[PDB]
Design a protein around this ligand. Structure first.
Ligand SMILES: [C-]#N
Ligand SMILES: [C-]#N
Lengths: 122, 122, 122, 122
């Protein structure tokens, strides 16, 4: 799925995810969020199962963005965990955790959970 | 927190997280899980906020492991999202998503969620 | 939103949620899962914000199902947390946690996370 | 575990959870949060597995609070999903989702995830 995964993806919020899948299971790229305390591209890194099951199962993968670039610092990081599904209308179906740096007092409210679906179009 | 983060960490389950923090916000290292369909070390990559707030907030960070190495493939990836807290008893407080590759029929049960606390000792 | 919420709802998996919203903030009804270790109807109870914001914000709500009825026991419970959004095509947008009873050794893998979107049709 | 569950619990934040477990699987009671936009008691309802596995597994359960009482409205609801574990140091180990009512624009940031551990003392 190296070929399947590598390229430009769009989620339901209009964010842009550009990724290269390595033969070693590496994910490298940039992420641009259509929403939140973000502007322009942020470095992402992650991993994927480079030898997935042959039974029509999806391909497990995940990656991280730290919301600091030359323009802004949101003192936060998002991790997406999900699976790539191939075929005519390929998808990456994810769930994500966004953790902010907080004081110990505010730690209980440090983390958001959500879900993003990425497609090759739109 | 490059110095603070870089090194060996242990979670409440007995797992071992060895990581180097780069000046650029990179996280790289290996993970050994004390539990689940895992043996020996797996590659990890992620990101951290290399310029956190100076108000005593923690440092946002995340990373991914894909559960394939030369020994095993568990067709799954975990992402940890959390914050590094410095001082005498330094911690990385995380929550994590573990997604398995699944069929479309089993996709609803693809993802576990949990929480890991990492310390420099035990 | 007492009127808006009360009735029959369907999620993307084909599951059926039948609920009565009380003036006091109560939710009561039954749930029928199209998937997993489930048959027929299970009791549900929950809560909703009976006096939501007047700014077009959605209505916060949650409920629980324990997966025991007269037919089966899946030694598990799901909680849905989300918001009701009114207007022409009303929705309940949720995220859910499914916890199984486990041994202390398997407790790390006790909890699934997912997302369900409920509509009045389909 | 009707007997085991019924009574007063306290979490790591110093919150108070007062619950009665019904023979039918019902949970009813009140919750007082030491943190966030909250004061005094809020109604809670939920469910638990009234006939759990006899293999030493914990008991699955869940409950909801909507953060409206006669004093305040935080336009939000929390659901706790977890398991009760019996014996000398009885625990309820939970994960939780807090959803706020939001605009469609802010819906991506609607939901916090955390974890609470409840004990009979402290
Ligand atoms: C921050 N709300
Ligand atoms: C159980 N997988």
């Amino acid at each position: 799925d190296e070929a399947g995964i590598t390229g430009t993806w769009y989620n339901q919020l209009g964010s842009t995810f550009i990724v290269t899948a390595g033969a070693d299971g590496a994910l490298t790229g940039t992420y641009e969020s259509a929403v939140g305390n973000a502007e322009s591209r942020y470095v992402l890194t992650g991993r994927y199962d480079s030898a997935p099951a042959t039974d029509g199962s999806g391909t497990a993968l995940g990656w991280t963005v730290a919301w600091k670039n030359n323009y802004r610092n949101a003192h936060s990081a998002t991790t997406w965990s999900g699976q790539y599904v191939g075929g005519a209308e390929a998808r990456i179906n994810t769930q994500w955790l966004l953790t902010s740096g907080t004081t110990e007092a505010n730690a209980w409210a440090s983390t958001y959970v959500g879900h993003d679906t990425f497609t090759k179009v739109k």
